[PDB]
Write a protein that binds this ligand. Structure first.
Ligand SMILES: *[C@@H]1O[C@H](CO)[C@@H](O[C@@H]2O[C@H](CO)[C@@H](O[C@@H]3O[C@H](CO)[C@@H](O)[C@H](O)[C@@H]3O)[C@H](O)[C@H]2NC(C)=O)[C@H](O[C@@H]2O[C@@H](C)[C@@H](O)[C@@H](O)[C@@H]2O)[C@H]1NC(C)=O
Ligand code: ZN
Length: 250
């Protein structure tokens, strides 16, 4: 299954937020982890305005990565480290750390019980948020190909959607066996933004799922907008290798 996305709503997103983690909490409150050394943060963000309502400015040495919210705690990984940070969502104080056993800290998501982690390999890791042991590694594959570059993750309805870094695709990955359930192609978002003059926006990255209202939000790094998107199943035939080219970059 391949989906395209329709933007239902655009919201401002801090165009300087190098989004590496995107969480929808509730009531139009997002949490975001931004990367870049010196700019990494965990943020509480108002969906409607993209206003940063609360920010934990990370140490300059960290490059904020995936973020998810689990049991009122934000779990964040960081780039080129196996350390994770846990923040109380209310104050964004780093209350606890963890380590994970991924190769890197890219994305995080949660099904509300466990953490899913990505490290940019094709492994979607299930991480126990108590022990921070790996529960399971899903080797995400599509058409025999590793779906590497699983980046920002979002658990949505039993699936973990993963931005695929440097694509405008999101992989829908079965939380059951890492099956690539579907590809979401979102080239329109970046393209339109670039058309609007946001020419140096970085990659699509950041998926947040609002289970309460059933809203998918996606944004990207340094994107000035965050998009509520609706997926539409592509019903037409997709060229062979299309996904491999666009989502797997070969
Ligand atoms: C999460 O993990 C980070 C990274 O290790 C912790 O921050 C680090 O905490 C170290 C232990 O306190 C800090 O090193 C100490 O610094 C002081 C001042 O120079 C020295 O006196 C002492 O001997 C240690 O060297 C280290 O600086 C700090 N690293 C960074 C990049 O901030 C973090 O600890 C928590 O946050 C930091 C910012 C401090 O407030 C710590 O006291 C606090 O524990 C770990 N978080 C948790 C909740 O464990
Ligand atoms: Zn997310």
């Amino acid at each position: 299954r391949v989906y395209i996305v329709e933007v239902l709503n655009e919201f401002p997103h801090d165009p300087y937020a190098f989004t590496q983690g995107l969480v929808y909490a509730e009531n139009d409150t997002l949490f975001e982890s931004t990367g870049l050394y010196g700019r990494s943060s965990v943020r509480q963000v108002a969906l409607q305005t993209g206003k940063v309502e609360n920010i934990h400015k990370m140490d300059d040495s960290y490059f904020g990565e995936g973020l998810t919210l689990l049991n009122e705690k934000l779990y964040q990984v960081v780039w080129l480290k196996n350390i994770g940070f846990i923040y109380d969502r209310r104050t964004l104080s780093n209350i606890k750390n963890f380590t994970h056993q991924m190769k890197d800290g890219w994305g995080l998501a949660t099904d509300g019980k466990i953490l899913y982690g990505s490290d940019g390999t094709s492994i979607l890791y299930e991480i126990d948020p108590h022990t921070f042991k790996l529960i399971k590694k899903h080797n995400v594959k599509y058409n025999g190909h590793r779906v590497i570059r699983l980046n920002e993750l979002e658990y949505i309805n039993g699936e973990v959607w993963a931005n695929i870094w440097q694509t405008d695709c999101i992989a829908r990955i079965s939380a059951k066996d890492g099956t690539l359930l579907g590809w979401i192609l979102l080239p329109n978002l970046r393209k339109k933004l670039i058309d609007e003059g946001f020419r140096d926006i970085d990659v699509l990255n950041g998926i947040a799922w609002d289970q309460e209202n059933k809203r998918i939000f996606v944004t990207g790094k340094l994107w000035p907008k965050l998009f509520e998107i609706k997926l539409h199943l592509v019903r037409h035939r997709i060229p062979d290798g299309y996904i491999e080219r666009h989502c797997l970059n070969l």
